[PDB]
């Protein structure tokens, strides 16, 4: 909270290690997102509206996410935060750890928050086909 851990160092002291993490995270998300004919090229912006996060969660936990539970084409800040916080709910419904990120932070393009989410998922699902 005021406690830095190893993951924080990627955004100041070790930019080289941030490059490795990013490449790895893209490799990982595309492994699952391509199954729905989707692709991420920009980690900095493409998870910010919640859509890919929700679908990624559906794919990871083999959960079929119904479209009235979220916003496939969000049109507002409220709809984006709904999506992200919903994705967090799917995580909790599966018994996963709550992310050290506020849904709003992801919508507001906070890279540290965005990447920590994906890295936590990557840590859990690294080996999943």
From Swiss-Prot:
Q: What happens on changing residue 21 to Q? A: Abolishes interaction with PXN
Q: Which domain of life is it from?
A: Eukaryota
Where does the signal peptide begin and end?
A: none
Subcellular location, record wording: Cell junction, Focal adhesion; Cell membrane; Cytoplasm, Cytoskeleton; Cell projection, Lamellipodium
State the protein's purpose.
Answer: Adapter protein that plays a role in integrin signaling via ILK and in activation of the GTPases CDC42 and RAC1 by guanine exchange factors, such as ARHGEF6. Is involved in the reorganization of the actin cytoskeleton and formation of lamellipodia. Plays a role in cell adhesion, cell spreading, establishment or maintenance of cell polarity, and cell migration.
Q: Which family does it belong to?
A: Belongs to the parvin family.
Record's subunit section? Interacts with DYSF. Interacts with ILK, ARHGEF6, PXN (via LD motifs), ACTN2 and actin.
Q: What is this protein called?
A: Beta-parvin
Organism this protein belongs to: Homo sapiens (Human)
């Amino acid at each position: 909270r005021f406690e830095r851990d190893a993951f924080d160092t990627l955004f100041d002291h070790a930019p080289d290690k941030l490059s490795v993490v990013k490449k790895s995270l893209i490799t990982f998300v595309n492994k699952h997102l391509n199954k729905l004919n989707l692709e991420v090229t920009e980690l900095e912006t493409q998870f910010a509206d919640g859509v890919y996060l929700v679908l990624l969660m559906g794919l990871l936990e083999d959960y079929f996410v119904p479209l009235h539970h979220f916003y496939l084409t969000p049109e507002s800040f409220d709809q984006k935060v709904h999506n992200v916080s919903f994705a967090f709910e799917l995580m909790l419904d599966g018994g996963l750890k709550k992310p050290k990120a506020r849904p709003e932070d992801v919508v507001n393009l906070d890279l540290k928050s965005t990447l920590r989410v994906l890295y936590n998922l990557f840590t859990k699902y690294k080996n999943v086909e």
